[PDB]
């Protein structure tokens, strides 16, 4: 049939909404005529370029997010839980090491990107564990089924210039597309380019794609 | 059968997303076991009684909104078109008048609230006409099917203290629920209270209610 439409998903494991958007597209890549391309980006890098302000700046907005997540995780069926101090410890510690590792993985082990991204989320957004320390990142990759030698090998590269600039490029591409936050999904359909922000634009995306929307947890074939 | 669940929708005709959320709930009040209670509120008051600035302050973000509206109007099937001087004209001015009239309508002519609200949006958000002048607001009420004498009568009360404070009270109730923008929908289900922001949370609202989601334009049959 018709060539699949390419979907570029820009995300940062630091983001709970990115994990929601990510699981939804991951589920639909076996149902819609699409080709999912995972693009590891840095939220901080995107908020920096886009000159975007902290969505928490507003007391009711930040509060709202923390009360919303526990409801959305049920709908989307993603085992996540609001950290003990998200806006404090995880956000300020950062994700550069994680995002750079995922970048290395997308360059050398593209078939593991999905699972390793999921494991890093399981740590920070499911078990409130740390994902800034090499041995922790390494544990995530190993749970994702990656061999210890291979994981360590990629980890050794996150300090490389190839990987460092690959991350900066990938997050610059998202801004060039107009990104101002994550998740950002860019859909390439019949010569057109759509940029959708958030994990609640998957139903609009189906419409633009001419695909059928069946909820965040569509029925497996 | 179980008593219907009350859904409170806070909206301001100034808001294009409030109109989207508004039409969605208006179409589902015939399908879901719910009771829709339209609550006219003033965005500006919500923006103040919460300290939340206009979302267009982030350059990349205002642009996203104006590009997204044309796509969402199709999905939702709502005849809207983006104004010209949205800022130094429609917004800079205000809707205080239109929201006060809608408040008077909700107090004396509750069965016309829906239609009149829909006609005021048709003006500002569909034909880019004005809705700050009495004779204009009047025109909206007439197209809604409201007799000119009745409409004029209500218009004469928008200066009253009853009406003025009713609008302030209603928009304050939104803030007490945690509102930081519009549309804000508050669902009361089994003793629990959910506050959902946006026209893109109806699919989560359906899950919380135990109802079936069938897109922004459910099968009226
Ligand atoms: N409404 C979106 C919210 C997504 C969101 O708030 N993402 C955060 C990072 S986890 C962000 O990038 N925000 C930028 C903004 O709100 O302008 C959803 O339901 O997924
Ligand atoms: N993504 C939401 C956006 C709703 C929105 O942007 N609402 C505006 C008024 S029209 C607001 O009150 N924004 C406050 C904010 O974004 O913090 C939707 O699809 O409804």
Method: X-ray
Starting at the edge strand found earlier in the chain, the sheet holding A192-197 runs: A34-40, A5-11, A184-189, A192-197
Which chain A residues are closer than 8 Å to B57 by Cβ?
A: 53
Minimal CA–CA distance to B209: which of B183, B179, B188?
Answer: B188
Helix (H) or strand (E) holding B39: strand B34-40
Nearest CA to ligand 1 atom 3: A198
Placement of tokens 């210890």 in the chain: A148
Helix (H) or strand (E) holding A5: strand A5-11
Q: How far apart are CA B66 and CA B68, in angstroms?
A: 6
Cβ-in-10-Å burial (0-12, 13-18, 19+) of A26 comes to middle
Residues with CB under 6 A from ligand 2: A 61; B 15-17, 52, 55, 180-182, 198-200
Cα dihedral B97, B102, B105, B111, rounded to 10, equals 160
Q: Do B61 and A50 touch (CB under 8 A)?
A: yes
CB atoms inside a 10 Å sphere around CB A55: 12
Q: How far apart are CA B184 and CA B175, in angstroms?
A: 10
- How far, rounded to the nearest angstrom, does the alpha carbon of residue A158 sit from its chain's CA centroid? 18
- Residues 6 or more apart in contact with residue A104 via CB below 8 angstroms: A154, A155, A157, A158, A160, A163
- Residues 6 or more apart in contact with residue B194 via CB below 8 angstroms: A71, B186, B187, B205, B208
Q: Is the CB of A45 under 6 A from ligand 1?
A: no
- Residues 6 or more apart in contact with residue B91 via CB below 8 angstroms: B14, B54
Q: Are strands B5-11 and B184-189 parallel, antiparallel or unpaired?
A: antiparallel
Q: How far is CA B78 from CA A137, A170, A183, B106, B127, in A?
A: 47, 36, 26, 23, 12
Structure tokens at B2: 């179980």
Structure tokens at A55: 């969505």
Q: Do A178 and B60 touch (CB under 8 A)?
A: yes
Cβ-in-10-Å burial (0-12, 13-18, 19+) of A210 comes to exposed
Q: Do B58 and A208 touch (CB under 8 A)?
A: no
Q: How far apart are CA B208 and CA B191, in angstroms?
A: 13
Structure tokens at A158: 């996150």
Q: How far apart are CA A149 and CA A156, in angstroms?
A: 11
Do residues A185 and A26 make contact, with C-beta atoms less than 8 angstroms apart?
no
> What is the CATH superfamily name and number for domain A4-211?
Glutaredoxin (3.40.30.10)
Name the residue ranges covered by the structural domains of chain B: 4-211
């Amino acid at each position: 049939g018709p060539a699949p439409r390419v979907l570029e998903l820009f995300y940062d494991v630091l983001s709970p909404y990115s994990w929601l958007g990510f699981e939804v597209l991951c589920r639909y890549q076996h149902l819609w005529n699409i080709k999912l391309k995972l693009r590891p980006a840095l939220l901080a890098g995107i908020m920096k370029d886009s000159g975007n302000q902290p969505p928490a700046m507003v007391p009711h907005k930040g509060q709202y997010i923390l009360k919303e997540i526990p409801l959305l995780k049920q709908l989307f069926q993603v085992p996540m839980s609001v950290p003990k101090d998200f806006f404090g410890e995880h956000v300020k510690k950062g994700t550069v090491n994680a995002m750079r590792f995922l970048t290395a993985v997308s360059m050398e082990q593209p078939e593991m990107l999905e699972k390793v991204s999921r494991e890093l989320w399981m740590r920070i957004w499911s078990r409130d564990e740390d994902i800034t320390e090499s041995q922790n990142i390494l544990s995530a990759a190993e749970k994702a089924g990656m061999a210890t030698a291979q994981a360590q090998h990629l980890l050794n590269k996150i300090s490389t210039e190839l990987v460092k600039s690959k991350l900066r490029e990938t997050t610059g591409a998202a801004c060039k597309y107009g990104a101002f936050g994550l998740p950002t999904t860019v859909a390439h359909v019949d010569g057109k380019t759509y940029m959708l922000f958030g994990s609640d634009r998957m139903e609009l995306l189906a419409y633009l794609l001419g695909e059928k929307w069946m909820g965040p947890v569509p029925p497996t074939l």
